[PDB]
Design a protein around this nucleic acid. Structure first.
Lengths: 46, 193, 147, 144, 116, 115, 46
RNA sequence: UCGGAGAGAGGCUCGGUGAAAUAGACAUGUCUGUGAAGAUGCGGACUACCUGCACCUGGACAGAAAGACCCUAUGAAGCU
RNA sequence: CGGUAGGGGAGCGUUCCGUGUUAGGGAGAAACGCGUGCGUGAGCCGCGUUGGACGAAGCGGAAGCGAGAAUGUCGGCUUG
RNA sequence: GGCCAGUGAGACGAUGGGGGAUAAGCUUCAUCGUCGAGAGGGAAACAGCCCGGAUCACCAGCUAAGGCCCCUAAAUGACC
RNA sequence: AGGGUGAAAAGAACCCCCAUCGGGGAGUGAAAUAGAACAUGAAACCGUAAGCUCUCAAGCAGUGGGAGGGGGACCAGACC
């Protein structure tokens, strides 16, 4: 359970950039919702 | 603006033609052009090949006929061409070799009792998977793995013998589908086959 | 504080293409030295020598600067058509050379350490080398061996 | 310096973590003020709102310090750095005590108008370099 | 595995889920338009369609089951005097699930229930 | 008589500057910068003596592969048979260099070794 | 059983390469005839 | 035997806050052999595209903690 | 002219002191960072759109005088 | 002799033996070789086995031990 | 345990973002990259931009050779 050693700058920038790329994937969805929130007949967002 | 990428690309290719020089082949070649004696001292250092020396387009092509040829000495004389140790341009760090083609893999001779006693066993990672498999079983089943197993242990199994492993073209039929560079037959130096 | 402007001198672009196409390429001819080639033996080691070449070698026992020095220990002198295979030396041979100023080459850090047996030695070595420029090769017109 | 093109806006050490501010700041890089205006209206992050406050107070800065428009204005770099981290000695069982760090950011966002010349043709002229300083202000692949 | 278990259970235990259903459909019948989460929205949709069509046939048994389900007293008797005059001929589909922005603090997918 | 100093940082900054392009904490982290200076210098030793040995090996196999292109069984050993019997003192395996820079001249070498 | 396995440095006195052919021990290096001494390496020319 | 289903709190995902023991640097395969006699690091062969997520803990002689057992100290102390 | 434990000889560096209110220095000292330079090396010398007031060499002396290790120790910041 | 240190745990290999079970990479001695304190080459890897004693440079040559099919330098060398 | 903005608070009038904190102009100052966390600011650590390069690959991450590519260049053969 206890880690034997530490990680490099290598593997950490890989994992942190996979985390922040996983943050990248959930804003073109927000760009699509922000673009559909604009002028148009949409039956949502009262 | 497609003309930026296209026209500036052709300007970069244009100054690639203007600044840089081609690399002449090593055939009916003297020591130096008079430009080359002004350039680097490529004489007193050991000659190292450039990218225009190991192009896979103008490599040699060899065809043996493995009918009634013994396996291991054929594998060694295929190895000595698959490295490039019959060329004076032999550097053991680049791919100076030559493509070879081995037709008639189904009729490869062996000496003694190889056919019933020599085993091509293999194993996956888990225990109890060691596959009992003898020479006549492959030669009945898939014959072009015989020679392909003989010469794979003849080449330096790093990143570079793995690249010249693909130069081997073994076919079990009497005819090969290659008409690449009009493949000249392979020269032998082995008096005992 | 603004975007600056368009500037208006009303220029006309010269598209004659007889000045820029003269300016951008360069005409530089290599000097034709001659069609000759030798292999000298200096110290112990042999050098490919052609007339005009800034070679490096060993001699700093004694040799003055800018001196005119004949390297008469020649084997395998070769022209464009024929070479002269030297039974050991080609006779009456003379590679005229210019022994130039003496040099010290790059530092070769000879640092030795064994293991936990605590021993380490930083020393350095500047090999006393000599650069030689080549004038011309002569005295080589015996026993031709062209093929 | 780009000859008077960009607008640099710094930020206080705001009371949040640097890494989540760096995913929400690595989203909005390269996109202009309208797209970041509509995305940071609707991004589901708590680190979204001071970033949107600094973009809004950065382009309003770019329209009041300079005199630009909020449509031809792309985010240039938007770098987020570390700040001061507080230390919180929080007790935990079996007589132990853990340092819980309260992290702060340091946001510096640079904005970029297009103040262009848009020259007619490409063809090089190796004459009058004291005009070649002014005619070329921001281009690519500089030879010699 | 959940093959064919078509009950929609929330993040709450069973009796607390029943009280969430009854209270939220009660105040849904009180105000008409309401802000829920989407799981709570569909969970209101089934039960409030059951309560519109329950007092559609305004007998005493339907009124007593309907009064037994809904909390408030004076809202069941304001219901069967309203649903045959309004929601006759509709024949199902009494609501609308207009979604909105997520909630600040949870990123909870947040919905909005009509009566149409 | 306090003696706080800076000489460990110049002592250490020189070794820091030598350890460039060492791929990670061998290029940044001081307590490995030292032992990569050390192991890099002994790597320079053994690879220098074995670059003498290794280029000897390379010229041997290069002129062997040049001589074996005749087809008739003339090995590299027989080229030295009739390279020292016909008195050619010590061409120093630089005929493996002009064997590719001047292949007609090495054909003149070998074709005068035959006669 | 009672046959001892040959361990390290007893493995080295047994399995080292030994050229146990009485011919190949007799071999001395080859002798070529002596040559006249090579001339000077260089010469002062003034 | 011989398990099976269901309800909660965790676990999984999202949004907030956010540690810890550990850590020479880690570009951190399997078999087999060798070696301070139990090797990802040495040798030969075979096998493996890179990199995550969720579980399991066989190894890293895993973490702890200068072995309570054994012995040594011209040690300490209690007791007889 | 390999070298552990170890012995001897010769040197570099640091801060202060004598020369010294030294030469030099807001026309940029010390610092910090840099080298296509020199040394057997400890190091010197030179260059800096950074910094802003001190301080060399030579000939000498004195040390809280030189760091990679002490489950060292004190601050800072990582890993997980 | 003067001043002044370490060391006093050795290990394997050949021979001469004792203890053992002429068992142990076992234990104790006597002469010697190596390692310790010894790099390089051969031994696949591998302190003690063979050659061999590393001041340094060379993109020099000849050899010892050992090798000359390929991986990997040199003979798919010759004759019994 | 926590010292040092300037020489002098001359400590930022006024405009914009704006609930503040903060930020940008302007103004003071020789210096505002001396802005109150304020003097030189190094390493670990976290980043962003530019050049080359990694997704059939076994490696104490080097070193010797160096394919291909990039940069300034002047002893254009050199250097990184």
């Amino acid at each position: 359970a206890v880690p034997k050693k530490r990680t490099s700058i290598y593997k950490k920038r890989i994992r942190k950039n996979i985390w922040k790329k996983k943050g990248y994937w959930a804003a073109l969805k927000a760009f699509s919702l922000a673009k559909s929130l604009s002028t148009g007949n949409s039956k949502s967002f009262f | 603006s497609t003309k930026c990428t296209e026209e500036w690309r052709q300007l970069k290719e244009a100054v690639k033609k203007e600044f840089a020089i081609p690399h002449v082949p090593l055939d009916q070649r003297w020591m130096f052009t008079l430009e080359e004696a002004t350039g680097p001292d490529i004489w007193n250092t050991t000659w190292y090949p450039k990218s225009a020396d190991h192009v896979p387009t103008d490599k040699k092509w060899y065809v043996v006929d493995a009918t009634d040829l013994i396996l291991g000495r054929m594998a060694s004389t295929i190895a000595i061409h698959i490295r490039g140790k019959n060329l004076a341009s032999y550097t053991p760090s680049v791919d100076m070799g030559a493509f070879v083609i081995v037709v008639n893999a189904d009729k490869v001779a062996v000496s003694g009792k190889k056919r019933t006693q020599k085993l091509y066993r293999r194993h996956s990672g888990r225990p109890g998977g060691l596959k009992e498999e003898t020479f006549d079983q492959l030669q009945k089943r898939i014959p072009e793995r015989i020679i392909e197993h003989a010469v794979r242990g003849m080449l330096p199994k790093g990143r570079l013998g793995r690249y010249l492993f693909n130069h081997l073209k073994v076919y079990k039929g009497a005819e090969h589908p290659h008409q690449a560079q009009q493949p000249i037959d392979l020269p032998l130096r082995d008096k005992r086959i | 504080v603004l975007p600056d402007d368009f500037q208006a001198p009303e220029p006309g672009t010269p598209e004659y293409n007889d000045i820029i196409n003269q300016f951008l390429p360069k005409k530089g001819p290599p000097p034709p030295r001659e069609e000759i080639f030798a292999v000298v033996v200096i110290g112990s080691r042999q050098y490919i020598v052609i007339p005009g070449r800034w070679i490096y070698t060993q001699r700093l026992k004694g040799a003055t600067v800018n001196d005119k020095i004949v390297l008469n220990k020649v084997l395998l002198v070769g022209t464009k058509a024929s070479t002269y295979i030297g039974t050991p030396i080609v006779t009456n041979a003379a590679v005229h050379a210019v022994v130039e100023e003496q040099l010290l080459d790059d530092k070769v850090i000879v640092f030795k350490y064994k293991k936990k047996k605590n021993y380490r030695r930083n020393i350095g070595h500047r090999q006393p080398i000599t650069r030689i420029k080549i004038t011309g090769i002569t005295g080589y017109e015996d026993y031709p061996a062209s093929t | 310096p780009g000859k008077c093109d960009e607008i640099t806006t710094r930020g206080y050490s705001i009371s949040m973590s640097v890494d989540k501010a760096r995913r929400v700041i690595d989203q909005i890089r390269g996109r202009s003020y309208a797209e970041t205006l509509m995305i940071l209206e609707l991004m589901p992050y708590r680190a979204c709102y001071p970033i949107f406050k600094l973009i809004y107070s950065a382009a309003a800065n770019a329209s009041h310090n300079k005199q630009f428009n909020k449509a031809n204005l792309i985010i240039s770099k938007a770098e987020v750095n570390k700040g001061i981290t507080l230390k919180k000695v929080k007790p935990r069982a079996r007589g132990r005590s853990y340092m819980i760090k309260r992290p702060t950011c340091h946001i510096t966002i640079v904005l970029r108008d297009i103040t262009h010349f848009d020259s007619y043709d490409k063809f090089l002229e190796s004459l009058t370099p004291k005009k070649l300083i002014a005619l070329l202000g921001l281009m690519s692949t500089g030879r010699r | 595995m959940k093959h064919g278990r078509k009950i929609h259970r929330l993040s709450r235990p069973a009796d607390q889920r029943r009280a969430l259903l009854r209270g939220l459909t009660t105040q849904l019948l009180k105000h008409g338009r309401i802000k829920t989460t989407r799981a709570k929205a569909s969970a209101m949709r089934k039960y409030v369609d059951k309560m519109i069509t329950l007092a559609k046939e305004g007998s005493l048994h339907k009124r007593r089951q309907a009064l037994g389900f809904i909390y408030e007293k004076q809202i069941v008797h304001a219901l069967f005097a309203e649903v045959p005059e309004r929601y006759g001929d509709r024949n199902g589909g009494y609501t609308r699930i207009i979604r909105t922005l997520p909630r600040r603090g949870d990123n909870a997918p947040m919905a909005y229930i009509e009566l149409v | 008589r306090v003696k706080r100093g800076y000489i460990a940082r110049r002592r250490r900054k020189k070794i820091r500057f030598f350890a460039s392009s060492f791929r990670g904490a061998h290029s940044r982290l001081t307590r490995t910068i030292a032992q990569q200076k050390i192991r890099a210098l002994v790597s320079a030793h053994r690879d220098r003596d074995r670059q003498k040995r290794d280029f000897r090996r390379l010229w041997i196999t290069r002129i062997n592969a040049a001589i074996r292109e005749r087809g008739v069984y003339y090995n590299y050993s027989k080229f030295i048979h009739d390279l020292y019997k016909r008195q050619l003192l010590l061409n120093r395996k630089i005929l493996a260099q002009i064997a590719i820079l001047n292949p007609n001249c090495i054909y003149m070498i070998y074709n005068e070794i035959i006669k | 059983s009672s046959r001892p396995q040959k361990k390290g440095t007893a493995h080295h006195m047994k399995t080292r390469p030994k050229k146990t052919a009485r011919w190949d021990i007799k071999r001395g290096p080859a002798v070529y005839p002596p040559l006249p001494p090579l001339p000077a390496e260089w010469t002062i020319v003034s």
